Design an enzyme around this catalytic site. Structure first.
Site, PDB file in Angstrom:
ATOM      1  CB  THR A   1     -69.014  31.106 -52.186  1.00  0.00           C
ATOM      2  OG1 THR A   1     -68.641  31.269 -51.277  1.00  0.00           O
ATOM      3  CG2 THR A   1     -70.807  32.371 -51.948  1.00  0.00           C
TER       4      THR A   1
ATOM      5  CG  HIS B   1     -65.564  32.648 -47.088  1.00  0.00           C
ATOM      6  ND1 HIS B   1     -65.149  32.096 -48.408  1.00  0.00           N
ATOM      7  CD2 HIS B   1     -66.733  32.478 -46.836  1.00  0.00           C
ATOM      8  CE1 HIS B   1     -65.626  31.264 -48.258  1.00  0.00           C
ATOM      9  NE2 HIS B   1     -67.270  31.171 -47.482  1.00  0.00           N
TER      10      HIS B   1
ATOM     11  CG  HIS C   1     -61.104  24.844 -50.611  1.00  0.00           C
ATOM     12  ND1 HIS C   1     -61.389  23.795 -50.735  1.00  0.00           N
ATOM     13  CD2 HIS C   1     -59.829  25.213 -51.176  1.00  0.00           C
ATOM     14  CE1 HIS C   1     -60.482  23.378 -51.633  1.00  0.00           C
ATOM     15  NE2 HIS C   1     -59.366  24.208 -52.005  1.00  0.00           N
TER      16      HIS C   1
ATOM     17  CG  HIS D   1     -70.988  31.719 -45.606  1.00  0.00           C
ATOM     18  ND1 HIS D   1     -69.599  31.640 -46.642  1.00  0.00           N
ATOM     19  CD2 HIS D   1     -70.879  33.637 -45.607  1.00  0.00           C
ATOM     20  CE1 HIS D   1     -69.889  33.092 -47.081  1.00  0.00           C
ATOM     21  NE2 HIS D   1     -70.533  33.592 -46.485  1.00  0.00           N
TER      22      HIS D   1
ATOM     23  CG  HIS E   1     -66.921  28.198 -44.361  1.00  0.00           C
ATOM     24  ND1 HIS E   1     -67.634  27.575 -44.738  1.00  0.00           N
ATOM     25  CD2 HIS E   1     -66.777  28.738 -44.852  1.00  0.00           C
ATOM     26  CE1 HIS E   1     -68.845  27.430 -45.474  1.00  0.00           C
ATOM     27  NE2 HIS E   1     -68.659  28.914 -46.023  1.00  0.00           N
TER      28      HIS E   1
HETATM   29  C1  LIG Z   1     -68.492  22.503 -51.045  1.00  0.00           C
HETATM   30  C2  LIG Z   1     -69.702  23.583 -49.584  1.00  0.00           C
HETATM   31  C3  LIG Z   1     -69.948  22.625 -48.780  1.00  0.00           C
HETATM   32  C4  LIG Z   1     -70.772  23.777 -48.112  1.00  0.00           C
HETATM   33  C5  LIG Z   1     -71.267  24.856 -48.149  1.00  0.00           C
HETATM   34  C6  LIG Z   1     -70.350  25.672 -49.051  1.00  0.00           C
HETATM   35  N1  LIG Z   1     -70.758  26.467 -49.375  1.00  0.00           N
HETATM   36  O1  LIG Z   1     -71.118  27.587 -48.258  1.00  0.00           O
HETATM   37  O2  LIG Z   1     -70.054  27.433 -50.158  1.00  0.00           O
HETATM   38  C7  LIG Z   1     -69.715  24.734 -49.927  1.00  0.00           C
HETATM   39 ZN   LIG Z   2     -68.500  30.064 -47.284  1.00  0.00          ZN
END
Ligand SMILES: Cc1cccc([N+](=O)[O-])c1
Ligand SMILES: [Zn+2]
Length: 257
Positions: A195, A93, A61, A116, A91
């Protein structure tokens, strides 16, 4: 399972995760004209000098840079927050083109990417417990625009060849996340969600106003990643962003005038 195609993307997630249509979903559009300055907000305290990066993982992802979160070594405090939040991973996007890729938008502007930095509230003991609480996580969001290179990003870019496909990891020690921050820590904040599935409504969002600049070359390398696993049909990891969701009964607050 869920992803970012036509058949499995954001618009489908609600079938497996009904909270997708909930009251506090993220991301959102930040309307800079209606976000009100809140003089009661504190400066953010980002204490990353003792951070211990361990590994980088392609999870199918995005890619996550993971930290040792077994002690208070990289923490976020202050700002809108009560208490102490430990950095677990960061991470990004990003888009297929420079004109999209961010999750949050600013007056409907999409940035090329969004970083993020995910932190969990130490009062709940572990991440898995924290995501069950409305104040369990604090995510620091930073926009990326394409211009000058970000020197502090290049170490990440250059390892991405080694984690091309879903499920690959690589050692990733001694990486300093301070090199990904903009000059100003002015921010907007609102209550929201993860998200990606499971879309849990556990996040205090802190979105920095000032973007960082990355080069075209840097972002191009993100777009060479794959969603698929090794020796599967190649599907470039691009457009791994959820679009803006309804703000509903929320206010976005600004730390700055
Ligand atoms: C599944 C998951 C795990 C850690 C952080 C996020 N996020 O920020 O959407 C999502
Ligand atoms: Zn994110």
């Amino acid at each position: 399972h869920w992803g970012y195609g036509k058949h499995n993307g954001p618009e489908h997630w609600h079938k497996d995760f009904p909270i997708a249509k909930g009251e506090r979903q993220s991301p959102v559009d930040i309307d800079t004209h209606t976000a009100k300055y809140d003089p009661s907000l504190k400066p953010l305290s980002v204490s990353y000098d003792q951070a211990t990066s361990l590994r980088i993982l392609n999870n199918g992802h995005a890619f996550n840079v993971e930290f040792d979160d077994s002690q208070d070594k990289a923490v976020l405090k202050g700002g809108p927050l009560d208490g102490t939040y430990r950095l677990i991973q960061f991470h990004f996007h990003w888009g297929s083109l420079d004109g999209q890729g961010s999750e949050h938008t600013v007056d409907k502007k999409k940035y090329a990417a969004e970083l993020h930095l995910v932190h969990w509230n130490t009062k709940y003991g572990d991440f898995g417990k924290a995501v069950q609480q409305p104040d369990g996580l604090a995510v620091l969001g930073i926009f990326l625009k394409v211009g000058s290179a970000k020197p502090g990003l290049q170490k990440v870019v250059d390892v991405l060849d080694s984690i091309k496909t879903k499920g690959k990891s690589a050692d990733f020690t001694n990486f300093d996340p301070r090199g990904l921050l903009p000059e100003s820590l002015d921010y907007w904040t609102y209550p929201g969600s993860l998200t990606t599935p499971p879309l849990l409504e556990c996040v205090t969002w802190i979105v920095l106003k000032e973007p960082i600049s990355v080069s075209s070359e840097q972002v191009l390398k993100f777009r060479k990643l794959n969603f698929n696993g090794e020796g599967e049909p190649e599907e470039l990891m691009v457009d791994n962003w959820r679009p803006a969701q309804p703000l509903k009964n929320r206010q976005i607050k600004a730390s700055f005038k």
